[PDB]
């Protein structure tokens, strides 16, 4: 019963949501530039900053709704396309349906849009995490950094082109564009003075991996003059070229997606970055690397043993889990948790295009939401209690019961209770790893889910419980409606996404 | 027996020695709707309930209800 109307509606929605975002950004930027001689806030109720905040927030939100609709259309379209290809067995019949483009808006960068489930999951993560982070950064943007209210819109446009393109070069360029806005945010919006050095560490560490990926892309392009991302089927790389490409790709994308030993920059940046931008970084900016690694390694044929890469990922997991205990800083502890989860996700991609990719994608989504939740809780603690250190913070539950309850439920979700996409992703990865290498699976599970979990829980429980006798004149009140509903939405997603259609998982 | 009662700040939403005057109506309006929700859940789930045969009943091996092996 599938008809061409659904196909064209899917394509039109995907194409036009990008232009909706772009036109919103363009209008907002034109207003901002041409309303004032100097593009800084006027400290009065009639400033354009209020309009810009409104436009950014409710462009992201409306584009997120349209993205939900377009993602559902894509799911139907992909399912029915697979059915059309698979169903017919007659040799004379073949599915050759050709679509003509609309005459209203042009194709951005003269590229035909191609959408995949992983790309749309990444785009949904971008939308939601960007919404949370923009909601967080309101107190940070003041009177000279208001120009960074558009950072998340720029991120959304970059990610949209990144996930809706079938061109290798455009793919790589979109991946590399993410550096400038993130560096500028960390440099100009971070309150702490150590953020200045943290930004440089972030730039250099990420750029080393960017150069590695650039070398790999140069190898692919120079050898294969193609750029369509599908002509690689008709060209085979020799053993030496293939091993060089996989090594470069893995190391370069692991610089971004933190792997052992390349997580020093991540720890520094998470500790010294804005509490609202740490959410976006951990939640989304480390998963574009995973998506790019998946695309490249599934496109290239590799005839090498992945034991070395699996060992690197497992070593990162073990290192982060063991170090969890020794952190009294909640933000650094959450950063180590992010490193652990990202290393597990990266390990999920070490078997080419096997079924491990499904667990990897689900784990990427759950880690995004869980890291957003954890960093937002740390943000609330730091903002109301003027410290994010375990020695200075104690007995949160008895003065701010809602915040303590949020911490406890965050710990329960992090533990991986059944009924959560966290548990589902752990089940996928461990079920595969048990047959792949059962002893390695046992070691990984033991370390991560006992030693790292206990180290993680020690600090959070100590902060939540106790007796806050110190500085009774300065104790805060409670979570606000904004914070409470953000926490509730994170919990709601982590719980209900387990009912998403199992066809794609 | 218990600890001596001490003042609790008004602004703080805590449960220390909280007693509600309207607890009777609150219980009435929290019990019955919960009972109706559970009744709906129960009748929904009963469609997918399984029970073994009764005392005087035996399962005919050739009846459709009897387990069937996969036919390659």
């Amino acid at each position: 019963m599938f008809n061409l109307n659904t196909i064209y509606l899917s394509r039109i929605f995907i194409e036009f949501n990008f232009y909706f975002l772009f036109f919103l950004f363009l209008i907002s930027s034109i207003i901002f530039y041409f309303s004032k001689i100097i593009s800084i806030q006027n400290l009065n109720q009639n400033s354009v900053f209020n309009f810009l905040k409104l436009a950014n927030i409710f462009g992201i939100l409306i584009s997120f709704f349209i993205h939900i609709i377009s993602f559902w259309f894509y799911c139907i379209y992909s399912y029915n396309l697979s059915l059309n290809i698979f169903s017919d067995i007659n040799l004379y019949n073949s599915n050759s349906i050709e679509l003509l483009n609309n005459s209203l808006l042009p194709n951005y960068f003269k590229s035909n849009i191609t959408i995949d489930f992983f790309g749309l999951i990444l785009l949904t993560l971008a939308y939601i995490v960007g919404f949370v982070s923009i909601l967080a950064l309101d107190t940070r943007l003041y009177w000279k950094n208001i120009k960074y209210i558009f950072s998340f819109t720029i991120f959304l446009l970059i990610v949209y082109v990144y996930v809706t393109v079938s061109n290798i070069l455009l793919f790589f360029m979109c991946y590399e564009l993410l550096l400038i806005p993130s560096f500028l945010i960390v440099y100009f919006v971070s309150p702490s003075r150590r953020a200045i050095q943290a930004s440089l560490y972030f730039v250099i560490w990420t750029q080393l991996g960017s150069l590695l990926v650039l070398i790999a892309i140069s190898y692919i392009i120079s050898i294969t003059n193609t750029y369509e991302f599908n002509d690689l089927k008709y060209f085979n790389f020799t053993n030496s070229e293939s091993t060089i490409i996989i090594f470069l790709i893995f190391l370069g994308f692991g610089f971004k997606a933190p792997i052992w030993p390349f997580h020093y920059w991540l720890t520094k940046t998470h500790v010294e970055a804005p509490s609202g931008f740490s959410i976006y970084l951990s939640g989304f900016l480390v998963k574009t690397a995973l998506y790019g690694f998946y695309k490249f390694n599934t496109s290239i044929f590799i005839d090498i043993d992945s034991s070395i890469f699996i060992a690197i990922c497992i070593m990162g997991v073990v290192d982060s889990s063991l170090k969890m205990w020794g952190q009294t800083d909640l933000k650094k502890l959450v950063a180590y948790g992010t490193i652990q989860e990202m290393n597990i996700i990266y390990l999920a991609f070490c078997w080419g295009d096997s079924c491990a990719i499904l667990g990897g994608i689900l784990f990427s989504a759950t880690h995004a939401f869980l890291s957003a939740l954890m960093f937002f809780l740390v943000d609330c603690i730091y903002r109301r209690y003027h410290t994010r250190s375990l020695v200075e913070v104690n007995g949160i539950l008895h003065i701010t019961p809602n915040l303590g309850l949020s911490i406890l439920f965050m710990l329960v979700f992090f533990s991986g209770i059944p009924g959560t996409i966290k548990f589902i992703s752990e089940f996928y990865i461990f079920s595969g790893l048990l047959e792949a290498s059962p002893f390695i699976c046992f070691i990984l599970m033991l370390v991560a889910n006992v030693l790292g979990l206990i180290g993680f829980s020690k600090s959070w429980f100590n902060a939540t419980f106790g007796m806050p006798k110190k500085n009774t004149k300065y104790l805060p009140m409670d979570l606000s409606f904004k914070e409470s509903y953000i926490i509730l939405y994170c919990f709601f997603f982590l719980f209900i996404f387990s009912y998403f259609s199992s066809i794609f998982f | 027996g218990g600890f001596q009662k001490y003042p609790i700040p008004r602004y703080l939403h805590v449960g220390q020695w909280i007693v509600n005057k309207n607890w009777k109506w609150n219980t009435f309006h929290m019990f019955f709707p919960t009972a109706i929700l559970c009744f709906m859940v129960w009748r929904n789930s009963m469609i997918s309930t399984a029970k073994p045969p009764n005392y005087g009943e035996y399962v005919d091996p050739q009846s459709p209800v009897a387990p069937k092996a996969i036919k390659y």
């Binding site: 009294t328 020695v391 007796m467 006798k469 110190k470 | 600890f3 001596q4 001490y6 003042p7």
Partner: peptide, 26 residues
């Protein structure tokens, strides 16, 4: 019988640090 004064704040005594919190005891 006696009208007792309200429960003492002394029941929870504030703890004052007198020794360095070594990072080796984190």
């Amino acid at each position: 019988g006696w009208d007792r004064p309200d429960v003492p704040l002394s029941f929870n005594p504030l703890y004052v640090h007198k020794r360095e919190l070594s990072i080796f005891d984190t």
